């Protein structure tokens with residue numbers, strides 16, 4: 001079949017793969033419980049991305065959706081990855097700053113909406129309605145970034161500077177990477193079809209790997225994960 005984007009699915013599989021192992025090993029050597037908590041979460045994130053990147057490399061998670069007069073290539077496995085990976089990341093951020101149960105619930109729920117409306121949008125046949133769904137998903141994302149920026153940051157000020165520091169970095173990395181997803185989606189295959197599938201896959205692996213292995217590297221080398 002050899003699709004053009006495959007080289008990127010292969011690089012993503014590999015990066016996600018190397019990251020899950022390194023974290024796994026690091027985490028089972030650690031004895032501190034809290035740190036163990038953070039390790040178990042952060043290692044799972046790329047582990048899942050790894051399976052999905054593998055599937056897509058092997059020909060799964062792809063479907064052709066009709067809209068705009070075309071049979072467009074829609075990688076739906078991505079939402080199968082992000083449905084569980086994005087909330088887990090919010091959780092790491094939530095545990096880092098002592099977020100309350102209610103804040104976490106609303107965050108994940110928001111996240112659930114964002115990924116669901118996003119997939120629904122990527123599956124929609126009427127071109128215009130694709131952007132309606134995309135719109136809701138993005139609005140849901142903004143709520144999440146808001147809580148993380150205004151909420152969390154504020155509560156991270158009750159922690160040690162080392163903890164608030166690790167968090168700001170993590171929060172900052174998240175805000176920049178997440179912000180880029182709706183835009184890639186809008187000018188890509190699910191959207192205006194301006195950017196070709198291959199460049200889009202590369203944009204997505206870069207963000208994905210940056211947001212999971214990048215985020216993890218920073219979180220796990222920090223002494224903030226300890227109780």
Ligand SMILES: *C/C=C(C)/C=C/C=C(C)/C=C/C1=C(C)CCCC1(C)C
Pocket residue numbers: 049082085086089114115118119134137138139141177178179181182185208209211212
């Ligand atoms: C490891 C993957 C991560 C951290 C993925 C984050 C993904 C997003 C913030 C995705 C957002 C989307 C929208 C705001 C609307 C359109 C569809 C999505 C799912 C691409």
